Amino acid sequence: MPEESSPRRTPQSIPYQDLPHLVNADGQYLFCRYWAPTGTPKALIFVSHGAGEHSGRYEELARMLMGLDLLVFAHDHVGHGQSEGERMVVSDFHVFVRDVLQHVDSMQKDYPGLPVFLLGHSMGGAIAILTAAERPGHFAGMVLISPLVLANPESATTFKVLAAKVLNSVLPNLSSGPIDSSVLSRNKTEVDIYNSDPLICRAGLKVCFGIQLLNAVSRVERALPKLTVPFLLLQGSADRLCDSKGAYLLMELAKSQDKTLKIYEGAYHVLHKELPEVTNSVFHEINMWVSQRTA
Template sequence: MPEPGAPRLTPQGVPYADLKHFVNADDQHLFCRYWEPEGPPRALVFIAHGAGEHSGPYDEIGQTLQEQSLLVFAHDHVGHGQSEGDRMNVKDFQVFVRDSLQHIDLMKGRYPNLPIFIIGHSMGGAISILTACERPSDFAGVALIAPMVRMNPDSATPFKVFLAKMANHIVPSLCLGSIKSKWISRDQKTVEEYDSDELNHHGGMRVSFAMQLLGATERIEREIPAIRWPFLILHGDVDKLCDIGGSQMMFDQALSTDKKIKVFDGAYHALHHELPETTASVLKELTSWISERLSTSPSQSS
């Protein structure tokens, strides 16, 4: 912790006083981004980014929605990007959900009568699902891009989970393999940008963090049968980082009457940074899906 009275700095050494941020319940400063339309916004859209990355790569989504008169906002999760916290480590996955609700409440305070949407990618998809489950009547819809609904079958066999749980008791700081950037996108420029982005976490994932992710997916699986809020799922069928089977399970089992899943043939994990035609299709899906729900009268969407 900094000395009393000393300015709080980002992990990169920038004073938070010079940046947009909020302070969470653990007195940690979280860096924020906002994409505000020129005129009055029609709705609020919160973006939850994935594990090991930050809110910066969502600029294209933010700008695209901003042009539709939507006010888009995001923050770097604890331990990510320009926010405080131990890198890619968290005491409880619920911290991500709690912080998301705090940021959403801050924006609701500024714009009390606007509908609210959430967009979540990868781990951010898990955060989005659990955030909406805590306040099911608060959100006009949740859009999920390759969400982490369940762990990949290859990495979460019963034996591997058993070993990880044992390791978590003995050496929780033990590092597992890092995210393989080649599976993020078929677009080589995207992979190179990911590898060179100093705000991304390029080290291994701790066993303790993997256990938090596993716990989140187990909680989601319990919540899915009770989900009734509107959602859109976009997933690539060659995604090796988040299991498409989890997305299909959510679509099949959720009680929502307003739900849609779209599968992109041959696409990898970061659909919003994929080959140009895929990215364009994803942006179109997001904008049209949100716009359609804004044109629905409140009596129809309740």
């Protein structure tokens, strides 16, 4: 008699049968999170995390949104956190967009008729933009926290040179250096938390993944004239990773009739984990913006 094989487990050895999950189109398990209110939800909102991190870092934002009577949901992107896949590798950047859409489509089956919002940060903001551009008119709104629209220009040249080198030869292990954690936030406690979290991948960026992030930048630029979704865009003026010029370009080139930019003077990249004055404002402004569009 044949027997069922041992249960599929996360990269951290936890059986997926013990966790909320979804299987993507490539047969890979994605770890999922849900924060639902006690009453009937006013809307759904998907939270899209950034490169090397994971959905658990959105706990406080998600609980705020749940307190507005939205049903919040998320998953760890392939290659990240508690989801399957080689760490920080993706066959094509569109895998991330496809998987968001699968999760959104699945949730709308269970909660039909509700508006759906997207919230994304950094790489996750690029994913959110491409998700909305693929389905014009489908999403009620998008909250973008320092989305990847243009990378730091000096850093971008580095990834472009390395890309051309790997694109010409066979160098599967080539990587750039790791992201300098000190540029993430002026809040030193949050920098220390980032450096302490075992679910964060702090290795150097593999050139193959950097190529896919360059693909995201190129695709985002082409998507802007197709973007009509309402959005709120939050950007630090001293962001050394996602250059503020990208935020201004998004405001200029998106066709959305409802678009708002808030600049945080002197703030670094991870605005929802910045100095308390900035983080409190970020939470408050997202609260107001979503409240006004779900009332």
